């Protein structure tokens, strides 16, 4: 009867219809709904348990600059920054804190290091004047949470009262049992009822850019759940 699956921000067991993504909002700090999963017709019910079900959620943002004659090799940012689980070094991390891509030169761009104290990052390359650039740094200073919807956009409850910060979420090394993250709360729902994963943070996150090298979908969520067939 019961199984233990993973569910992702796209498709998976659902089929890309009863998922929906969305960005947050910047100027009004508000508890937006960045993702939501609706139980399809075919399942009987879905469960969700804390301290039983593992999780992963790698968000990012997007920013841009303008090429100049001066040898920049460094860019400021609008988002608080830190390393992935802490380290000054690049390529030792579980994943890159930041990625950069040049529109003109359709190539990746490495990263040397950064201050990780102010909103700063180094670039290893020397961008030319007029060249367009994009960057997908780490995100910080946010809160994440869950809530349930009974087919109508009509809340009935909340999985767990207190929000967990995405900041801390990046801080812990993920994907290690014993050190794996496990939120609290014990939810369950049935056909056409929705779980919404909600965000409260200033910086504008992303889901799709169509010019990101390390995979198509920039960010990701991967959550464990229990299903009754």
């Amino acid at each position: 009867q019961t199984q233990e699956y993973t569910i992702n921000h796209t498709g998976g067991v659902l089929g890309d219809s009863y998922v929906t993504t969305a960005s947050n909002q910047t100027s009004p700090q508000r508890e937006t709904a960045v993702l939501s999963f609706e139980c399809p017709r075919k399942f009987e019910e879905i469960n969700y348990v804390g301290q039983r079900d593992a999780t992963r959620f790698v968000p990012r943002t997007t920013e841009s600059i303008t090429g100049s004659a001066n040898d920049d090799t460094v860019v400021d940012l609008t988002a608080n920054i830190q390393p992935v689980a802490g380290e000054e070094v690049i390529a030792e991390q579980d994943y890159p804190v930041a990625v950069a891509y040049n529109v003109t030169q359709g190539v990746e761009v490495d990263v040397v290091d950064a201050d990780y104290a102010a909103d700063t990052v180094t670039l290893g390359t020397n961008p030319a004047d007029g060249d367009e650039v994009k960057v997908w740094p780490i995100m910080s200073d946010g809160d994440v949470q869950f809530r349930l919807i009974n087919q109508f956009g009509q809340e009935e409850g909340r999985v767990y009262p207190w929000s967990t910060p995405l900041y801390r979420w990046h801080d812990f090394p993920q994907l290690k049992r014993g050190r794996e993250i496990n939120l609290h709360g014990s939810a369950s729902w049935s056909e056409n009822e929705t779980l919404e994963i909600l965000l409260d943070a200033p910086q504008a996150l992303t889901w799709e850019d169509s010019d990101y090298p390390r995979g198509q979908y920039v960010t990701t969520l991967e959550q464990d759940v229990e299903i009754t067939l």
Binding site: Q3, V13, G215, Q216, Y217
Partner: protein
């Protein structure tokens, strides 16, 4: 020699007769990238805490989009899947292939037990998002069970006769 028990411990991989693979493109869930079959008059057993380890690659020798999904799944005869008995519905990300097999922490196990009668099938479906590179069978590898190791488990095998 000391007579070893019939319940022998083995580990699976590509270069075997009762396994097969075939290339995959994009957004092709029904196609099994890898197929396994029970040999004749043998019985295979896979416990719940059995390690798992795919190493799919791109034709150019690169890892694929970690949003990609992998699903091991048991099947009735005639290539027919089943809902029950499925194990390891995982994503292609979050392995750390460098330290995957070596570190028990990064080692991933299955969810529930499993058994393979003499003529049965186990498939490994893959879901790649579109506008992505396809799988290349020359570079891909599978391993399940960790023989010769203190952690993890090993795939049991026994002669039916």
């Amino acid at each position: 020699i000391g007579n070893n028990g019939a319940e022998k411990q083995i580990s699976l991989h590509k270069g075997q007769p009762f396994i097969d693979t075939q290339d995959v493109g994009a957004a092709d869930p029904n196609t099994p990238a890898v197929t396994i079959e029970g040999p004749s008059d043998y019985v295979i057993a896979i416990d719940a805490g059995t390690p798992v380890a795919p190493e799919f690659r791109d034709a150019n020798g690169d890892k694929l989009d970690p949003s990609t999904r992998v699903t091991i799944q048991k099947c009735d005869k005639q290539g027919n899947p089943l809902g029950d008995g499925i194990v390891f519905s995982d994503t292609l990300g979050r392995f750390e292939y460098s330290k995957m097999r070596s570190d028990p922490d990064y080692m991933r196990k299955t969810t529930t037990s499993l058994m393979i009668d003499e003529r049965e099938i186990v498939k490994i479906f893959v879901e790649v998002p579109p506008n992505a590179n396809g799988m290349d069978a020359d570079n891909s590898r599978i391993t399940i069970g960790d023989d010769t190791s203190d952690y993890g488990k090993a795939v049991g095998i026994v002669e039916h006769g």
